[PDB]
Amino acid sequence: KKVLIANRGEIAVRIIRACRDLGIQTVAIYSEGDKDALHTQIADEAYCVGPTLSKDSYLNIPNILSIATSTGCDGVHPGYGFLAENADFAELCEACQLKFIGPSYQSIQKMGIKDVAKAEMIKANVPVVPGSDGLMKDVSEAKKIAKKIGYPVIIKATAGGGGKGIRVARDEKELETGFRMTEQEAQTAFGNGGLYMEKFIENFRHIEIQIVGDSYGNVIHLGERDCTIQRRMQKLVEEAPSPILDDETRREMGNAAVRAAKAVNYENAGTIEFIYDLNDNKFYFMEMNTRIQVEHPVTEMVTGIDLVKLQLQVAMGDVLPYKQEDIKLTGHAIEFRINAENPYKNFMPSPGKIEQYLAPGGYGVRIESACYTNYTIPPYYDSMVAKLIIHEPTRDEAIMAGIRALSEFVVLGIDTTIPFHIKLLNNDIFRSGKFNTNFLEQNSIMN
Amino acid sequence: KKVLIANRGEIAVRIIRACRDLGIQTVAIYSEGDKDALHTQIADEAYCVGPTLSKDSYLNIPNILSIATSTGCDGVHPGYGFLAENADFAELCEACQLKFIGPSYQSIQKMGIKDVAKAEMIKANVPVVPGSDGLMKDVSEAKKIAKKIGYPVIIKATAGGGGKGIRVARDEKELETGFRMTEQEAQTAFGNGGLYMEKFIENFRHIEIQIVGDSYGNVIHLGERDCTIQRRMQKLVEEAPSPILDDETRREMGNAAVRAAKAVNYENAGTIEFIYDLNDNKFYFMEMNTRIQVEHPVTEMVTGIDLVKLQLQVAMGDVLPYKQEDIKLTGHAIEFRINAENPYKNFMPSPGKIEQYLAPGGYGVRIESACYTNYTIPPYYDSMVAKLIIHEPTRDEAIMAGIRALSEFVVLGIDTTIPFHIKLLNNDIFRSGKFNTNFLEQNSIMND
Ligand SMILES: Nc1ncnc2c1ncn2[C@@H]1O[C@H](COP(=O)(O)OP(=O)(O)NP(=O)(O)O)[C@@H](O)[C@H]1O
Ligand SMILES: Nc1ncnc2c1ncn2[C@@H]1O[C@H](COP(=O)(O)OP(=O)(O)NP(=O)(O)O)[C@@H](O)[C@H]1O
Ligand SMILES: [Cl-]
Ligand SMILES: [Cl-]
Ligand SMILES: [Mg+2]
Ligand SMILES: [Mg+2]
Ligand SMILES: [Mg+2]
Ligand SMILES: [Mg+2]
What we know:
The structure is a homodimer.
Chain A: E1 2-5, H1 9-21, E2 25-31, H2 38-42, E3 45-50, H3 61-70, E4 75-77, H4 87-94, E5 99-100, H5 105-112, H6 114-123, H7 139-149, E6 153-157, E7 166-169, H8 172-190, E8 195-199, E9 204-213, E10 219-231, E11 234-240, H9 247-263, E12 268-277, E13 282-289, H10 296-303, H11 307-316, E14 332-339, E15 341-342, E16 348-349, E17 356-358, E18 365-368, E19 384-392, H12 395-408, E20 410-412, H13 418-425, H14 428-432
Parallel strand pairs in A: 1-2, 1-4, 2-3, 4-5
Antiparallel strand pairs in A: 6-7, 6-8, 9-10, 9-12, 10-11, 11-14, 12-13, 14-19, 15-16, 17-20, 18-19
The complex binds phosphoaminophosphonic acid-adenylate ester (2 copies), chloride ion (2 copies) and magnesium ion (MG) (4 copies).
One chloride ion binds next to loops of chain B.
PDB class: ligase
Keywords: bacteria, biotin carboxylase, ligase
Assembly: dimeric
């Protein structure tokens, strides 16, 4: 009946749209900085939750819970980021008679301590990257494990998110220096300096499987997303299906992801991330995001399934409206994350007022955005202007259509990364579809 | 390689987008009044064709042909309206070695003299609305036929388009009066005063079938569009598939449409309009539109087929890349034509500068517009702001999702018809899916 959206930006707008499609009432929250945010305008009601820094606004749990109960909400949608993978917030909602629109706290706990997640996958017969058994207490056993696994190794925060608390070590001296750095950063960022170690995979594709469970033990997958085009770990361009994957591997990986989700009795939407090793064409579980993702639209276009609406439906108590045999991926979709950065200045942030915003339309085109003419993106959270998604019958058609779409997208007053994406789509290595995660790093797409 | 777009507005934008998908270079034209027009920005080059009134700009054939050859274009896409159903311009293009993106002039002649179109359909074994065979010489001849057909009748210009030269006669005296007014109006408008007569069908549903043929004898249909929500003759809300139609009638009408198409060796995209009579559940051919239509995108979403790209593909000599067995309509789409009119003032036109324009997005939404912030829609042409299309798995879902999308569509500075479409979507009759073409005439949505 009524849902509080515990987020901001384009995901808040997105969830709000999903609620209205189901006739659900919407409560937006905003920080002092987000006073002009679009989601606060399109919500049925909006409430200030605290000052600009996320720690006192969007992560201010007592205030979010307070507002939620005060206004008579039945649930809370966390979106992505902020409190979406926070098991304690999830538990507190439940204790308030508020439905956390997402998986259980037990589920968030199990998959949210990434070393424990791995051990759970080994027991659900899911392959995982060779590595340490749980956390390393010392550099000493980090050095011991790393010589057992073989360099290069990657040291990762077990409580980790947003790319923070991850370091490659290519020799013992790097592992020694990187251990203390990552432990420090993790304790600060997460209140948990526990680190685990993995073989650092060098030639792979980032393949992730969308899963969705209901409250009745039914789990399905909506195929894969290919998120190999990455700058500094962070995803820039996502596509569905993967250009390099055959139907037998899609099926084998989808089945692995469904085993993953039910080993932890997973409910609502999540994503299994897999490392697809191009050296032997084997996949490895890397982690689960126990939440909706930025890139969900690429999947929604090829599958025809409204994933956020399905999140709300699953939370309201609906059984899954599709079994696995009803799911098909039709056509090809590619998402471009358009940020307020200048690709001609090595992606230097570009703050300012948007003087002209003209979003493209036409066949195949979906624009996801909270930006509008005269809007100023506050520099304290994010750089996302829009996600553009192109859906065509083939990949080459999506590429041609994407240039078309991207080429008429007017965002003036600030620099954006549209030019980067236009240049990528004209790149012959990209068009070949054959490449790994290092692609941006061992090329110079901007010329 | 290079194509001139012989149109304006949102359809020029649509065409230019389809050209860029194919790697084709684009030449926009514009009237003096259309200097700010979005299609002139996104085109590769833009040229002035002349003064604001269409007669000297967008219907200026000598100037359009000069720019097409001057700039070295291979074809001309006429969109809809203006020169799209002008056989003589199609001929002229062909004589200039320009591919008219559409059917042959011969086909444009056959189906564009509407009484002859009808006669061709009877030979093609396609049902037509009862009436006269050919034109009526005289008011006397109209009187005799109208007595034979039985009142009520509708007198229709044979060279008629844009809904001019059509009026109902419920009795003799009306017919005497209607004949002369319609003959005068059709002469003025079309240079052809010839009228034909049909039974005026009073309880019906507007069901039209999308056709596409290629240059190799292949003709497919992409199912139906239901355009029953009309206001004074003009379409307002379209949906695919028709909510009141089973798949046996879908096949029947599709096969009827396909016979019609190849009866005239039809190439490229056309639409066959049927009258679906709710008294006996019978369909009758009313006319063919030998062109793409305003409402094509609702078909494109349900079928996944890019129709305007397919027009270009067909015009470059491509074999139809779809077979009939492989065409499925999936889910349900509703298009809403959003105009610069005030629905709270009986749709009074609302001229002005648009001061804020915010297109909704999200799941299932597709916006078709040439409008933007600080744009002023000239009051000289077809007054569209945007088409909004919603595509969902079911009709009820589409309705809900369209309220969502329409409710956040911001257009400030002019009044628009957005509030009418929101009131339509909350109407119980519309939601039932059961109504006929006089729905907005028997109902008053704006009071709801
Ligand atoms: N074993 C590995 N070998 C090579 N690269 C890795 C490995 N583990 C992680 N990475 C890279 O580091 C990125 C982030 O890893 P991940 O384990 O997803 O961290 P995260 O902080 O949870 N990020 P998020 O996806 O936002 O939750 C991955 O997308 C890979 O590009
Ligand atoms: N026999 C009929 N009985 C009842 N209504 C009719 C009949 N013929 C036409 N109409 C109505 O008049 C409208 C216009 O007729 P039509 O033959 O489509 O003319 P047009 O000028 O070619 N319009 P267009 O579709 O823009 O090319 C139809 O959509 C019907 O609503
Ligand atoms: Cl994400
Ligand atoms: Cl039309
Ligand atoms: Mg993570
Ligand atoms: Mg990850
Ligand atoms: Mg007509
Ligand atoms: Mg018509």
